[PDB]
Every structure is written in C-alpha cells, then in structure tokens.
Amino acid sequence: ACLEGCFCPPGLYMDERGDCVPKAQCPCYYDGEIFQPEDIFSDHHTMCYCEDGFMHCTM
Amino acid sequence: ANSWALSSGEQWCERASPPSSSCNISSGEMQKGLWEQCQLLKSTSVFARCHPLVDPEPFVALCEKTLCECAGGLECACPALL
Numbered sequence: 613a614c615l616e617g618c619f620c621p622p623g624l625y626m627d628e629r630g631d632c633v634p635k636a637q638c639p640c641y642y643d644g645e646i647f648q649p650e651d652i653f654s655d656h657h658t659m660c661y662c663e664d665g666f667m668h669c670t671m
Numbered sequence: 672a673n674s675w676a677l678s679s680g681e682q683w684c685e686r687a688s689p690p691s692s693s694c695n696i697s698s699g700e701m702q703k704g705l706w707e708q709c710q711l712l713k714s715t716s717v718f719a720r721c722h723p724l725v726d727p728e729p730f731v732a733l734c735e736k737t738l739c740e741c742a743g744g745l746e747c748a749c750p751a752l753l
Contacts, residue, residue, distance in 0.1 A: 650685055650686070661686070663686060
C-alpha cells in the first residue's frame with residue numbers, strides 16, 4: 613500500500629547502517645552474502661559481479 | 672573487455688557503463704539519406720573485389736549505429752570505411 617513512516621528522497625536508497633545512499637554504493641545480496649559495490653567474483657565456470665545494487669551473473 | 676582492466680596507484684578504475692544512446696529518439700531523416708555512405712562499401716566497384724577475401728557485412732553493421740549521434744555530416748561514415 614501507500615504507507616506512512618520515515619523515508620528519504622527518491623535519489624537515495626536505504627543502507628543497512630541507518631544512512632541511505634545513492635545506488636552507486638548500494639551493496640548486493642547474492643545468496644544472502646552482502647557484497648560490496650565493486651566485487652568481481654567467480655568460480656571456474658560462472659562469472660559474477662556487483663555493479664550498482666544488482667548482481668550481474670553469467671556462465 | 673572489462674575483465675582485461677589494469678589499475679595503477681595514481682588511479683584505480685571501476686566498471687564503465689555502456690553509453691545510453693541518444694539516437695533512439697532523434698531518428699528522423701538521419702537513417703534515410705545517410706544509409707548510402709555505409710552502403711557504398713558494397714556498391715562501388717573499388718570495394719567490390721575484397722569480398723572473396725573479407726565480408727563487409729560487419730563493417731556496414733558497425734557504422735549504422737554511429738551515423739546517428741553526429742549531426743549534419745556524410746563524413747561520419749569514412750572512419751568505419753577507412
């Protein structure tokens with residue numbers, strides 16, 4: 613619904629530490645694991661990175 | 672291409688983003704009259720003889736996406752042609 617509470621402006625998104633930040637340093641939550649805004653990351657076969665909040669995986 | 676990045680101490684660098692093309696709204700006449708300068712890789716006789724050695728199909732493919740950001744010029748085709 614259209615709820616009531618404490619938000620921050622649309623350019624800013626909520627971070628875990630109470631502050632809210634733009635989507636540049638908004639971490640990724642792949643498989644529960646909290647990855648930093650720039651984390652290149654790969655097993656042998658898969659290839660994954662965190663750009664701006666989303667986790668871009670490939671194969 | 673972003674796997675083969677190499678940083679230094681003066682500057683550490685991040686993943687570049689693909690550019691958001693402004694061509695998608697400023698289409699207009701720019702694709703009608705300027706389709707020919709890409710096309711003359713295939714039509715003109717001076718280029719009509721490397722076809723058994725190479726294929727111009729990628730070259731014409733890569734030009735048509737860059738004839739759209741420059742305003743008012745046929746010269747925008749000669750880089751991909753050169």
